[PDB]
Amino acid sequence: DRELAILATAENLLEDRPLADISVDDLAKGAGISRPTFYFYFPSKEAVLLTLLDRVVNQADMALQTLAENDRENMWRTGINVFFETFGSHKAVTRAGQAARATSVEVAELWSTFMQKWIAYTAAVIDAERDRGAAPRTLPAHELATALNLMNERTLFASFAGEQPSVPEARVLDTLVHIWVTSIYGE
Amino acid sequence: DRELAILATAENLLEDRPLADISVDDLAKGAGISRPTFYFYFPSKEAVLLTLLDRVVNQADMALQTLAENDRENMWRTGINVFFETFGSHKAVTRAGQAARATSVEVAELWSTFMQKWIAYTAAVIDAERDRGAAPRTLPAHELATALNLMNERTLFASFAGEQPSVPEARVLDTLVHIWVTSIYGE
Ligand SMILES: COc1ccc2nc(-c3noc(C4CCN(C(=O)CCC(F)(F)F)CC4)n3)sc2c1
Ligand SMILES: COc1ccc2nc(-c3noc(C4CCN(C(=O)CCC(F)(F)F)CC4)n3)sc2c1
């Protein structure tokens, strides 16, 4: 498709510079189409990013659903690793998509929809752990799930962007898993 | 000062709308000065926000220094509460300042400088807890401190903005304290 060519070009260019510094002409050129032909597939470069982010969050979400059809530390590590690997494989899209949350209501709403879904799935697993006697009844599961998921969002994305400060990318999985296991199973 | 009047006006208007929708004329008007007189004190509305954020982060930082000159759960709760109360007392400045991290290198660098300072202070306290035998030698203190501080940044600011998703503001302190105590003292 010309559609897939535009998406691949946008992902490539986002590795070099932000969306602000990519023109519809750059996207058309890389995709081997004219400018007006671009506007047939997407109303704006912003819509291209929204589509790229939607594919990445759906890939993470489908990978977590795959896990869910089947030791406590290794379970949480495997689950966190879906997001580490999936977002970690699409750092430029992840970075540009997180920035676009501030300027695009559609990007804000996509990110918010999936965060609510992943928080609800986390809380359901914590509740099942509590029901089976593996985890103590401490905080409300949904509030614990919210903070742990927000920690992961901020910590993954700071590490991938090499922000100062950040956990080094080679330490971020062990770091998050420790905090998830001690806070879910502790006291 | 006319300076203090501009800062107070900016903090007031940021409660109603974002910086983008506040003009130098609104700031001058509220401060009882002309437009050119405004430019005597500040080069831009962006500089006004940078100054407001600098005062708020310094107030938090001075309050934490005050604590530091003197049960483990209550210690961490008191320390987290400096940020909850200080930022919670300046929600409009906090919100606009966090958004400005994306568009102002000076705002990005202020926030990054103080986060490094608070992470280093957290890690020093964790290390002292380990040295005294109160906390086990688990993760590297500085990496644990980084993730817990990033959790607090994201969780406090989502709660204050009423984002979906967020921990309710009346639950956020208990939530963060649980995760800090179990991850610092656990295993
Ligand atoms: C085969 O058996 C298994 C194996 C693994 C496994 N993991 C499970 C799980 N439940 O909830 C979560 C979170 C989703 C959000 N999550 C995130 O980190 C979200 C990151 C973000 F997108 F938020 F930034 C972290 C894991 N994982 S159930 C399960 C069953
Ligand atoms: C009288 O005895 C006491 C009493 C309290 C007490 N608290 C201490 C402490 N050490 O590190 C921190 C963190 C700073 C960053 N922090 C944040 O939440 C930062 C929030 C952010 F700005 F990051 F968003 C959370 C507490 N607190 S030592 C101490 C000694």
UniProtKB/Swiss-Prot annotation, chains A, B:
<dbReference type="Pfam" id="PF21313">
    <property type="entry name" value="EthR_C"/>
</dbReference>
<dbReference type="GO" id="GO:0006355">
    <property type="term" value="P:regulation of DNA-templated transcription"/>
</dbReference>
<comment type="function">
    <text>Involved in the repression of the monooxygenase EthA which is responsible of the formation of the active metabolite of ethionamide (ETH).</text>
</comment>
<dbReference type="InterPro" id="IPR049397">
    <property type="entry name" value="EthR_C"/>
</dbReference>
<dbReference type="GO" id="GO:0045892">
    <property type="term" value="P:negative regulation of DNA-templated transcription"/>
</dbReference>
<dbReference type="InterPro" id="IPR036271">
    <property type="entry name" value="Tet_transcr_reg_TetR-rel_C_sf"/>
</dbReference>
<dbReference type="GO" id="GO:0046677">
    <property type="term" value="P:response to antibiotic"/>
</dbReference>
<dbReference type="InterPro" id="IPR009057">
    <property type="entry name" value="Homeodomain-like_sf"/>
</dbReference>
<dbReference type="GO" id="GO:0000976">
    <property type="term" value="F:transcription cis-regulatory region binding"/>
</dbReference>
<dbReference type="GO" id="GO:0005829">
    <property type="term" value="C:cytosol"/>
</dbReference>
<dbReference type="InterPro" id="IPR001647">
    <property type="entry name" value="HTH_TetR"/>
</dbReference>
<keyword id="KW-0238">DNA-binding</keyword>
<dbReference type="Pfam" id="PF00440">
    <property type="entry name" value="TetR_N"/>
</dbReference>
<dbReference type="GO" id="GO:0003700">
    <property type="term" value="F:DNA-binding transcription factor activity"/>
</dbReference>
<feature type="site" description="Inhibitor-binding">
    <location>
        <position position="152"/>
    </location>
</feature>
<feature type="site" description="Inhibitor-binding">
    <location>
        <position position="149"/>
    </location>
</feature>
<dbReference type="InterPro" id="IPR050109">
    <property type="entry name" value="HTH-type_TetR-like_transc_reg"/>
</dbReference>
<feature type="domain" description="HTH tetR-type">
    <location>
        <begin position="1"/>
        <end position="60"/>
    </location>
</feature>
<keyword id="KW-0678">Repressor</keyword>
<feature type="DNA-binding region" description="H-T-H motif">
    <location>
        <begin position="23"/>
        <end position="42"/>
    </location>
</feature>
<comment type="subunit">
    <text>Homodimer.</text>
</comment>
<protein>
    <recommendedName>
        <fullName>HTH-type transcriptional regulator EthR</fullName>
    </recommendedName>
</protein>
<keyword id="KW-0804">Transcription</keyword>
<keyword id="KW-0805">Transcription regulation</keyword>
